[PDB]
């Protein structure tokens, strides 16, 4: 059994909504440390890694370490009942359901049946990325949306002093550019001129959970996967690994 | 002829919108006291009783007592043209149309044809309810929406010290609970342990017109109709009687 | 080549969105004075005349006078990427594309291909209007929407001391009236009692670009076109000429 409590139910709902666009079923592992979940999208192109440490919860009691399998759409639909100011309680007793309770002026408790999800057969290659870019959330969210207007593919180019996202359709073309003079670009570390391209329909989902003022970390390499990392409630970490399009 | 004037056209529009989800055609009776309307939904499961006393109108002149029949959808579509700060004037001369005028920076006058509506052949049984619950509007609106996620039916249970709404679908389940310790519960009077169940699709419409901070009165009995009462502009009263599902 | 810069990208987007509801392809002529565009809708019922003087731009450099042909839907889709606080830059080099750049925390540059648009074979008759009405934007926007509820046609009537818009459907009817006592009516000049009627589906698009507090000028005549003029950023001028319905 466990009980974990999170203040601000909507914010937790938004996090599961983000992940649920990419992931249909996920194993969430509860330990004394926090909650972890690792899962691939249906095309097996994006890996999601979510870490929610104890410190982001108001009360956190994991009496025994336990992994539960969750339908993400169903989980999202329930969480969406939560208000911005609801307190959210997730509690598991021995039965195969998760109790999900919202506390405000009343106590409203849902029962979500759990499912059997087989955990990832992980064979991640070494990822010797050659470029790291830290940019403001707003730039990345804007840029992806700009590129989706234009193409189904977006190219990322990192050079010593500039980060460029470029996309080209039949008719239209966009280029989003960033040098260290721009407010949007917080850090750029480039070992070597680095270029790779990615499917935008994945990127469009990945960036939905980003706040405008978030620092977002990108790590990538030449025709290599993109690693995209950002924080949830400062200490929670949401990490995507996205296969390249080439 | 009559002329009644209501300050804040949108608020009047919202009231007719609420009722129009359940009622297609209604007889509104204008007297010196105020306006009354009583009507059943098309399934003959919900009775609506609306009372709008003189005191909620800025100017109120009913020269002769008169009942008019109104298509509610049409009435709603026109009222929806009104702005939050429009003044609304309803005036009837001898012709079979209602003049509906919005006054702001201009005077905009609609003509709504009236129709012949046969008034209710009322045979209401005695309703010896055994439970009264007064709760905050927000709890009832939340709870119904929670239950609609889960089921087409909702069960209400009232005991001496707790009010519970419960719903169960194929897969999901919710329970909304209230004791006198909760802010949501303002009054509970229970003669006898009381249980009844109701169609949620009716309840979902009934609660649309409720403000978050409204006191809502429920009266019900074992496998008996639910009476749901709340106020409009403090002195206007909107009362539903809803047949049980059993 | 030219470069013109406009502070507040959304506001420019809203202007092109307004025009794009009526106009599919337009020739924009850039001179030292400002930008002008004149075009007819596909039914050849509405003429649009837009004038954007230098003074509404933050920086304005037109090195050579040049006319470019623009697909308005495409232009609108790109401009819609702009934020309220983006700076917008339109720049043309010798190639047949317009560069459209949004500058905020990053610099985002789109390429829009240009097209060949044959310029208007203008034979405008003399328009001896007999009525001028200056009214508040809010009244005109409300009134058109009121009339569209009711009919596909709206009649405008101007007399010495009153302006009336009237519409009549099968069942419903509206009348929007204005005398100089109303706040909505800023100026009325009538040579002669003046009546004309117009298609509302045109008027509904024409009024979308009007702010609530705008002074809007109407000039019309008996069974004559309506001239509707209002300002953009105080000095830019948007003028429609709309053929009568009779």
From Swiss-Prot, chains A, B, C:
InterPro entries, per database record: DNA_clamp_sf (IPR046938), Pr_cel_nuc_antig (IPR000730), Pr_cel_nuc_antig_C (IPR022649), Pr_cel_nuc_antig_CS (IPR022659), Pr_cel_nuc_antig_N (IPR022648)
Record's keyword annotation contains DNA-binding: yes
Keyword DNA-binding: yes
Gene Ontology biological process terms in this record: leading strand elongation; regulation of DNA replication
Pfam family, one: PCNA_C
A GO molecular function held by the record: DNA polymerase processivity factor activity
Domain of life: Archaea
Keyword annotations: DNA replication, DNA-binding
Activity regulation summary: Inhibited by interaction with the PCNA inhibitor TIP.
Chain's role: Sliding clamp subunit that acts as a moving platform for DNA processing. Responsible for tethering the catalytic subunit of DNA polymerase and other proteins to DNA during high-speed replication.
Record-stated family: Belongs to the PCNA family.
Quaternary structure (record): Homotrimer. The subunits circularize to form a toroid; DNA passes through its center. Replication factor C (RFC) is required to load the toroid on the DNA. Interacts with TIP.
Protein name: DNA polymerase sliding clamp 1
């Amino acid at each position: 059994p466990f009980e974990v409590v999170f203040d601000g139910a909507k914010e937790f709902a938004d996090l599961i909504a983000t992940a649920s666009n990419l992931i249909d079923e996920a194993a969430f592992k509860f330990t004394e440390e926090g909650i972890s979940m690792r899962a691939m999208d249906p095309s097996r192109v994006v890996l999601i890694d979510l870490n929610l440490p104890e410190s982001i919860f108001s009360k956190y009691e994991v009496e025994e370490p336990e992994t539960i399998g969750i339908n993400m759409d169903q989980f999202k639909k329930i969480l969406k009942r939560g208000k911005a100011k609801d307190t959210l309680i997730l509690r598991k007793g021995d039965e195969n359901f998760l109790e999900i309770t919202f506390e405000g002026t009343a106590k409203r408790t849902f029962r979500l049946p759990l499912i059997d999800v087989e955990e990832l057969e992980l064979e991640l290659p070494e990822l010797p990325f050659t470029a790291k870019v830290v940019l403001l959330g707003e730039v990345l969210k804007e840029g992806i949306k700009d590129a989706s207007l234009v193409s189904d593919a977006i190219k990322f180019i990192a050079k010593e002093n500039e980060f460029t996202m470029k996309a080209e359709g039949e008719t239209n073309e966009v280029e989003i550019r960033l040098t260290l003079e721009d407010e949007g670009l917080l850090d750029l570390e480039v070992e070597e001129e680095t270029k790779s391209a990615y499917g935008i329909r994945y990127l469009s989902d990945m960036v939905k959970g980003i706040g405008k003022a978030d620092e977002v970390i990108l790590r990538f390499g030449n025709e290599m996967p993109l690693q995209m990392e950002y924080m949830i409630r400062d200490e929670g970490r949401l990490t995507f690994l996205l296969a390249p399009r080439v």
